[PDB]
Amino acid sequence: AGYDKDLVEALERDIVSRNPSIHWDDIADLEEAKKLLREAVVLPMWMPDFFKGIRRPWKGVLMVGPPGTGKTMLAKAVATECGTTFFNVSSSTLTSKSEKLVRLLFEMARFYAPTTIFIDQIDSICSRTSDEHEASRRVKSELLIQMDGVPSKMVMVLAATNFPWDIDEALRRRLEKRIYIPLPTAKGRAELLKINLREVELDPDIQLEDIAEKIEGYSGADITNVCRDASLMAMRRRINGLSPEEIRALSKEELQMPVTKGDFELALKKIAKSVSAADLEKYEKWMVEFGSA
Template identity: 90%
Template structure:
């Protein structure tokens, strides 16, 4: 952990708060609190850990103060136009049949200011005083009839804008903001809210072994713009789309969830079934609704898994008209998100992550919009050893188990293959324990009797049963595509 980076971010958060840039200050404070929380988990010295927790508590108090200032400023916003009274003294009631003297131009009251008109008697439309009154008169009926209607329209519009803004910003700190689905089918909105939105995937960088290059690029594309909003502007704006290419089971979905967890964004996990419907035109509405919700819940990560199934090449003979419309809408919405990013602050960022096992089937226009295309390879020897440690951290391991030897034996295995090997090996002892027992005897076994350590023999038996799932020919195809279209 870079302690200098923590100090710099804390200093910038305080400086932005003193300068009145409270939004950027809150972003820096959130980043520092996450960094200190992660650093505390890595400490082993109790005394040092207590000191860091005290620092984190002080920064949390500062963050709450900045947030209270923002809430106070929000409460000062004017709900509707204010009608100021006429500063001039009230005049005595006049006879409506008598014309008033003309008012000089320099003393005329502006049209938007409402003058008090106390003491005026109700007049009929055919009154001569109402028919011949000039523009300088006090009681123009047309102006008086039009003015309240115009003011009511302005007031209604101001309330509507205020309500929309309040819905987006949230009513209070303890309430979760809710997307306003006006204009959309409520069933579609509820389905996306229920099935897609995940605000805390709870996957961290430490849960992913190896893949340092991919982690570095994703930090640069998503996390750093949240911590350094003033730097990532103009030509240095964040990447609007990242495509992860690689064999199955190499950790592409895990990387996307780690991005959402580390930078605190709302995570949308999208598949082809999410964006398809049997009704004509509804799939395109789903695509548009997805991006509208993503902009509302920004900062957001949209992860489109197996994107080749949604946006394959257009113009092929077996392409359906509905499929083409969905692809076109997806491409339009992705460009719309990118255009908004150029002039928007990173706290409103919408990041599109995509993953595929068949990059050669993706449409050319989509490939252009996914500006960064990175290769997620099979784990190296060091990565395989780390994967074994991560998979076995909840299981007791016997002293004869040599993870380095096992890592050499599983060369060519993907991350999912290694997880399957560890799962099968951890169940070997239980299988031996219940062998030959009756169902009643199995149910009578205690938890301690089944908690037996995993041995080297268990791994050898598991390796005989589980083979690698990626062939050498597949790896050559990925490397050839990356050499032609890669953008690391």
């Protein structure tokens, strides 16, 4: 016990998830990304005869792509299938709060014998004051050491990035398998809308299919925020006219009004896609040069 123990506990509250169990069928689309991810991290467990005598497995796995596509949900799905402990490591915030944390992290992962370490926004470790450049350098050196080291005592490392071009060559070398996570297609944006609109009534004049086409380029997080924004505005029109006594007395179901076409029109005009066509060009070019076999 003592300071080292509370360090382990402080990292535990930050990295372990509240709902780490995601199943593949709970994730829309990503059929190609799911297949490439399972072959890279699940097939070696299933076929040790093939991956110890025919073809060695990939050493590291890096998920690249635009933000809001569900890289964290896919990483949780790998942990749920493999039956492992899931650590959600935010690299950008772990540097702010050194090298000891990196070793303690992998020491915890080894302690919870089968563990999946998800290192999110791993490109931030290679960020160009002076102390930050030294702390990020120490964190990167200890990370390469731990990643170079990795039946029931298995520790796999999964990484994700929205800017793969910012990852150093030494860190890219420990992430052999690179998998692109795409934005939803025209068909994919339609099912994400209806799943996000399962607890809110919609006026009949609202055209969901017209919305699914207009939101081309939107990520899964963008569609969610458009549905949450339109539902917030419809809910606020009821709340604003009510008194506190009435607000306290009304239940969840009575406070949410139906969402109108004006709400969706306003939410869509306030929330543009976070990814441009030029952005997708950069991902494609990077995938051509560095995409894994």
